Amino acid sequence: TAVVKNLAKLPAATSQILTNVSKLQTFHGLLEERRDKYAPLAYHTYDNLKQKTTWHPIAHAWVDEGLPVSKKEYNEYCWLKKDMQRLLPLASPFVFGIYGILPLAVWLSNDGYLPSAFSSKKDIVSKKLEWYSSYGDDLRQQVGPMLQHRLKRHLRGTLNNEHRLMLDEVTESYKEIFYSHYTGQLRDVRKCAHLRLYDGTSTVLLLTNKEPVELTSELLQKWNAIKAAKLSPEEEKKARNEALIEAYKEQELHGGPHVKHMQGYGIPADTPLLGENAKGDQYTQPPESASIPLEQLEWTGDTVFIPAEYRTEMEDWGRELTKLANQFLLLPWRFVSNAWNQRRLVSWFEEILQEDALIAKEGGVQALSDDELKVALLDRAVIRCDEELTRGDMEARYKEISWLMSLRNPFIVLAWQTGYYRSTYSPEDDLPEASILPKLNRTVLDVDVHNELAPDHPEKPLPRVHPALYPNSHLALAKEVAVLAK
């Protein structure tokens, strides 16, 4: 059986395990050496109830743009981290006793529970694909639908309170995202992005020596322009502070930052003077920084990200939804808080973003092979091995989820992913009949990301316009056109 088949190679596996541990140690040393000087400090923050940490990718998932590492090497890093996770049953005899060998036997029974060393294959890509096709796709295919249902019922709420909890403008997008297994039509990622309307406006407060300022597209454009100009720091900081005071005046004319009038957040006013400390009409006591002149406004280097996720936040998800998201992403989930599973999910998210960056450095998706792209999509959890799609469809799927994960929101990511895991079984043998049309094929051009899409009104859905029909499409798609024709 597989027990004796794996026991036969158990002696030959320890050397490979230790070699992999050495590679992991070297790689983590290198990566942390880079991270400890280029990456900022994402402080730990606690949930609304202030008992457990909460995690978000915008702050904690950092991408080393400029990482001198091969994509296959990063795949090795992540896969060996998962192998370290899978090596945990070796501690059972060292905590239970000599009778703690039966857990090790159960571990050695199934090959999917095991690390890389017990596999006959050599290449990391073929090895990962074997593991997925043997164990991982099956485990994910039995969690996908029930996670989709939990996400639905998290939006719409329980016990017939949809008229109190759902929104009437995201309705058609909700239907297209969650009930496309009924129609068989493809989905547009922008309709999944429309789910963020349940949340508020995500803001970024830059902390200065006087007051916090809300970041805008204009200020960000100016800062990117100044950073691209490659000026001396005496001019760089001056231009940055000029843009900063300009934006400060702009928001002061707007009526202050958006955070002042949001439930759960707020900026305090000047402190009050109590009793005899009140000096006539001056009932307030301004801060020390009020003495500083406004022309000396300088950025402290500190930032505060506020997703304002009132319905989407991972804190309010629950004990079950987090565990099922980690099952669906093949992460550890048992016997841990939702904060620890949140961190595991954010680490996976960061890995996927770093992998996207390295692919873009290595020349995009088309430079990859077919098996490598299949394994990438399996890691992204948008493909099941019982599909056998084309290369253009795989590339379009990757582009879709890459743009969707660029927004840094796990809820919409899971809503997108779970749609590709709704498979049925027929009770009859003759039905379903053999189709007559060819397989579904697409291209990178069919994905509309460079254009905005308004939310369709309820019970008034609009047809899908191809990007090619837009004006100047041959100009906008020229990069993708050159990449595909080449």
Ligand X SMILES: CCCCCCCCCCCCCCCCCC(=O)OC[C@H](COP(=O)([O-])OCC(O)COP(=O)([O-])OC[C@@H](COC(=O)CCCCCCCCCCCCCCCCC)OC(=O)CCCCCCCCCCCCCCCCC)OC(=O)CCCCCCCCCCCCCCCCC
Report 139-168 residues binding ligand X (CB under 6 A).
139
338's contact among another protein, ligand X, none, with CB below 5 to 8 A by partner kind, is: ligand X
Q: How far apart are CA 380 and CA 330, in angstroms?
A: 11
Q: Which is nearer to another protein, 373 or 410 (CB)?
A: 410
Which of the 8 DSSP states describes residue 459? T
Name the amino acid, one letter, at 436: I
Interface positions, 338-367, toward ligand X (CB under 6 A): 338-339
Positions 60 through 119 that interact with ligand X (CB under 6 A) = 88-89, 91-92, 95-96, 99-100, 102-103, 106-107, 113
Interface of this chain with another protein, residues 363 to 402, rule: CB under 8 A:
none
The item of another protein, ligand X, none sharing an interface with residue 36, based on CB under 5 to 8 Å by kind, is: another protein
Crossing angle for the helix pair 370-380 and 338-361, to the nearest 10 degrees:
150
- Report the alpha-carbon distance of residue 271 to residue 263 in Å, rounded: 20
Identify what 220 binds: ligand X, another protein, none; CB under 5 to 8 Å per kind. another protein
The one of ligand X, another protein, none whose footprint includes residue 107, by CB under 5 to 8 A per kind, is: ligand X
Complex with another protein: residue 235 or 270, whichever CB lies closer: 270
Nearest to 411 by CA among 179, 177, 185, 204: 177
Which one of another protein, ligand X, none interacts with residue 370, CB within 5 to 8 A by kind? none
Residue 315: CB minimum distance to another protein, A = 7
Residues 156-185 that bind another protein (CB under 8 A): 157-161, 164-165, 167, 175-176, 179, 182-183, 185
**What are the angstrom distances between the C-alpha of 202 and each of 41, 169, 256, 409, 442?**
20, 19, 16, 11, 33
Residues 39, 64 contacting (CB under 8 angstroms): yes
Beta bridge partners of residue 457, listed in sequence order = 460
Shortest separation between residue 486's beta carbon and another protein, angstroms = 28
For 315-345, b where at least 16 C-beta lie within 10 A, e where not — what string?
bebeeebbbbbbbbbbbebeeeebbbbbbbb
Radius of gyration of the chain (CA): 26
Residue 45: in which H helix or E strand, if any?
A: strand 45-46
Residue 369 binding: pick among ligand X, another protein, none (C-beta 5-8 Å cut-off by kind): none
Q: Does 432 bind another protein (CB under 8 A)?
A: no
Q: Which residues of 389-428 are buried (b: 16+ CB within 10 A; e: fewer)?
A: bebbbbbbbbbbbbbbbeebbbbbbbbbbbbbbeeeeeee
What residues numbered 79-118 form the site for another protein, per CB under 8 A? 95-99
The separation between the first and the last C-alpha atoms of the chain, rounded to the nearest angstrom, is 49
Rounded to a whole number of angstroms, the minimum distance from the CB of residue 107 to another protein is: 18
Contacts of 133 (CB under 8 A, 6+ apart): 385
Tell the smallest beta-carbon distance from residue 369 to another protein (Å): 28
Please tell me whether residue 190 binds another protein under the rule CB under 8 A: yes
Amino acid, res. 37: K
Contact 54, 45 (CB under 8 A): yes
| Binding at 192: pick from another protein, ligand X, none (beta carbon under 5-8 Å per type) | none
Near another protein by CB under 8 A: residue from 52, 121, 249, 439? 52
Maximum distance among all Cα pairs of the chain, rounded to whole angstroms: 91
What is the per-residue DSSP string for 418-440?
Answer: HGGG-----S-SSPSPPPSS---
Give dist(CA 126, CA 355) in Å, integer: 18
Residues between 8 and 27 with contacts to ligand X, criterion CB under 6 A: none
290 binds, among another protein, ligand X, none (CB under 5 to 8 A by kind): another protein
Residue of 34, 42, 53, 448 that binds ligand X (CB under 6 A): 53
CA-to-CA distance for 468 and 445, rounded, in angstroms? 8
Determine contact, residues 414/328, Cβ cutoff 8 Å: yes
Q: How far is the CB of 391 from another protein (least distance, A)?
A: 27
- The reply on whether position 287 binds another protein by CB under 8 A is yes
Is the Cβ–Cβ distance between 476 and 470 less than 8 Å?
A: yes
User: Considering CB distances under 5 to 8 angstroms, the limit depending on partner class, which of ligand X, another protein, none binds residue 363?
Assistant: none
Question: Pick from another protein, ligand X, none: which does 333 bind, CB < 5 to 8 A by kind?
Answer: ligand X
- Least distance from another protein to the Cβ atom of residue 462, Å: 6
Stretch that binds ligand X, among 46-54, 194-202, 357-365, 432-440 (CB under 6 A): 46-54
The count of other CB atoms within 10 Å of the CB of residue 453 is 16
Task: Point out which span in 102-110, 127-135, 152-160, 371-379 binds another protein (CB under 8 A).
Answer: 152-160
Q: Does 277 bind another protein (CB under 8 A)?
A: yes
* Interaction of residue 436 with another protein, rule CB under 8 A: no
Q: Is 336 in the site for another protein (CB under 8 A)?
A: yes
Is the Cβ of residue 324 or residue 413 nearer to ligand X in the bound state?
324
Segment holding 234, helix H or strand E? helix 233-254
Identify which of residues 13 and 167 has a Cβ nearer to another protein in the complex.
Answer: 167
Q: Name the site residues for ligand X (rule: CB under 6 A).
A: 51-53, 88-89, 91-92, 95-96, 99-100, 102-103, 106-107, 113, 139, 318-320, 332-339
